[PDB]
Structure formats: C-alpha cells, structure tokens
UniProtKB/Swiss-Prot annotation:
Residues 12-279 form the Protein kinase domain. It is found in: Cell membrane; Endoplasmic reticulum membrane; Golgi apparatus membrane; Nucleus membrane. This is Epidermal growth factor receptor. Changing residue 173 to E: Found in a lung cancer sample. Changing residue 34 to K: Found in a lung cancer sample. Binding of the ligand triggers homo- and/or heterodimerization of the receptor triggering its autophosphorylation. Heterodimer with ERBB2. Forms a complex with CCDC88A/GIV (via SH2-like regions) and GNAI3 which leads to enhanced EGFR signaling and triggering of cell migration; binding to CCDC88A requires autophosphorylation of the EGFR C-terminal region, and ligand stimulation is required for recruitment of GNAI3 to the complex. Interacts with ERRFI1; inhibits dimerization of the kinase domain and autophosphorylation. Part of a complex with ERBB2 and either PIK3C2A or PIK3C2B. Ubiquitously expressed. Isoform 2 is also expressed in ovarian cancers. Changing residue 19 to S: Found in a lung cancer sample; somatic mutation; strongly increased kinase activity; constitutively activated kinase with higher levels of basal autophosphorylation; more sensitive to gefitinib than wild-type. It comes from Homo sapiens (Human). Changing residue 135 to L: Found in a lung cancer sample; more sensitive to gefitinib than wild-type. Changing residue 5 to A: Abolishes phosphorylation. The lineage of its organism: Eukaryota, Metazoa, Chordata, Craniata, Vertebrata. There is a cross-link at residues 16, 37, 54, 57, 167, 229, 260, 270 (Glycyl lysine isopeptide (Lys-Gly) (interchain with G-Cter in ubiquitin)). Changing residue 19 to C: Found in a lung cancer sample. The gene is EGFR. The modification Phosphotyrosine is found at residue 169.
C-alpha cells in the first residue's frame, strides 16, 4: 500500500540537534504544513552528502516501503523531502537509541531485556526481509527505544530494495561502517539479506557487552584481513556457549551457512522464555 508523502523542505523548522553520524545529522524539528498554522514535532534525519539521481531513486524506492511498515519493531517513515538534499521525516523518539541506552543502564539491564531486544530486532529485520529490503546499516546505534521493553529498527537512507529477481545489491563507493559489515560487503561491496545477519550478529554482541566498541583499537584498514584469518568478536562475559555459538554462526564466511532471520526469531524466543539459563548476569533477579 502507498502512503509516502513527499514534503516541501521549507515546511520544516529545525530546532535542536539530536545527533550526527557521518551519513548525516538528526534534528529535533517541527513540521509546519503550508497554508496551516499548526506546528507538529517531528524528527528530521538529513543526509550529509548530496546524491546522484540513482541514489535518489533508490532511496525513493526504499522509502515507499518504509512509509508502509506494519511491524511494531520498525520505524515507519512519516515523510520525505527530496529537492536537493534528502531529509527523512520521522516520529520523535525521546528515550534515545538502544546503544546509548545500555551504556547508562548497564547496572539495571537484566537477561530478560537483553534477550527480548534480540527477539524484537530479529522480528523487525525478518519483516524487512519479507518486504525485500536489505537494511545495510543495522547497528545498535540504529535501534531506537520506544519504551525499554519496546525497541524499533530505524533507517537513515542506506537501505535498498531488491528487484523481484535480484538477490544481491552491489554498491558504489562511499563511507561505510566497516566493523558491522559482512565480508562480501567489505571486499565486493555486495549486500544480501544474509549480510544483514552478519550485522545483526554484531549488534547483539554490542548489547551483550553493554555497548562495547567492535574491534576497539583495531583500525578499519585491517578488519578485512583479520576476518579472513578466522578471528571474530570475542565471547561476552555474560554469554553462554549457546548464545555465543549463535553470534558466531552469523559471522560465517559462507553466507549460506548463516542463520536466516526467521530461524533466529525462534532460537532467541525459546531463550527469552528462560533467560537465566542463557545469560549469566550478576544480580539478575534484582532488576
């Protein structure tokens, strides 16, 4: 179904800055319709680098899907400004992203929450798969907290829609988040749903470690060759062999030997219904 509204970028007033990556900055803004006097609070993700009419078209393509999501675990796109620079308009999310969240509630996050967040992120991703979207930038900094028991996956415009025949999306050059990408992605600039699984795996590591940096210290220049050896992100302290051994399956070289997002919703659910068996967190019942 078609819901995407394309809006005049002069209908938006930018107010405060909520963030800024390298792919663009996020504003706390204010949509003020034209010919109207009401002013409605939105959040505005604006992309830094201007975009080729191919980039524009692919975004526009991806955005008609994002403007129609049913899933509770994906942020629905509210609107978009295309003009010169592209701006994704989207609902305000006051609790912040999940990464910043775990970093300052580390002492109060228990196993039920961690495991439930994993189930939700997976659910959200599986939905996008069913919609033929390759998310291309899954990370914990791109997961938002609606409420601490309810996280949602969000897009900053780097998602791509697979043709009805396509299985891969080969990407041009640009700035990339290396420490979350599959290998095929770092070498061949190829992206599959299966690569999203790689990223999912890193995101989860991020959470189990309570907001640690992947490969902290190591420069992005090396990652590609470190992987080729067989080294991966280390097992988190709270993790049991059962949880880690899933993460690891996500960082398999042969992307056909990674778990599918639906297989992943199943394992993490059976775990989320007996959390103390799977994560060994200190003072776990006391939260």
């Amino acid at each position: 179904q078609a819901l995407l509204r394309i809006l005049k970028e002069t209908e938006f007033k930018k107010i405060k800055v909520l963030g800024s990556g390298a792919f663009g900055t996020v504003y706390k803004g204010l949509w003020i319709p034209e010919g109207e006097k009401v002013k409605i609070p939105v959040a505005i993700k604006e992309l830094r680098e201007a975009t080729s009419p191919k980039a524009n078209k692919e975004i526009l393509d991806e955005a008609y899907v994002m403007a129609s999501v049913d899933n509770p675990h994906v942020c629905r796109l509210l609107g978009i400004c295309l003009t010169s620079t592209v701006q994704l308009i989207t609902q305000l999310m006051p609790f912040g992203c999940l990464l910043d969240y775990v970093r300052e509630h580390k002492d109060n996050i228990g196993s039920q929450y961690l495991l439930n967040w994993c189930v939700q992120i997976a659910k959200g991703m599986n939905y996008l798969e069913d919609r033929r979207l390759v998310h291309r930038d899954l990370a914990a900094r791109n997961v938002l907290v609606k409420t601490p028991q309810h996280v949602k996956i969000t897009d900053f415009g780097r998602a791509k829609l697979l043709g009805a025949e396509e299985k891969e999306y080969h990407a041009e050059g640009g700035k990339v988040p290396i420490k979350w990408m599959a290998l095929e992605s770092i070498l061949h600039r190829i992206y599959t749903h299966q690569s999203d699984v790689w990223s999912y795996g890193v995101t989860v590591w991020e959470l189990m470690t309570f907001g640690s940096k992947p490969y902290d210290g190591i420069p992005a220049s090396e990652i590609s060759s470190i992987l080729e050896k067989g080294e991966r992100l280390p097992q988190p302290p709270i993790c049991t062999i059962d949880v880690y051994m899933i993460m690891r399956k996500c960082w398999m070289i042969d992307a056909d030997s990674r778990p599918k997002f639906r297989e992943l919703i199943i394992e993490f659910s059976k775990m989320a219904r007996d959390p103390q068996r799977y994560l060994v967190i200190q003072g776990d019942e006391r939260m």
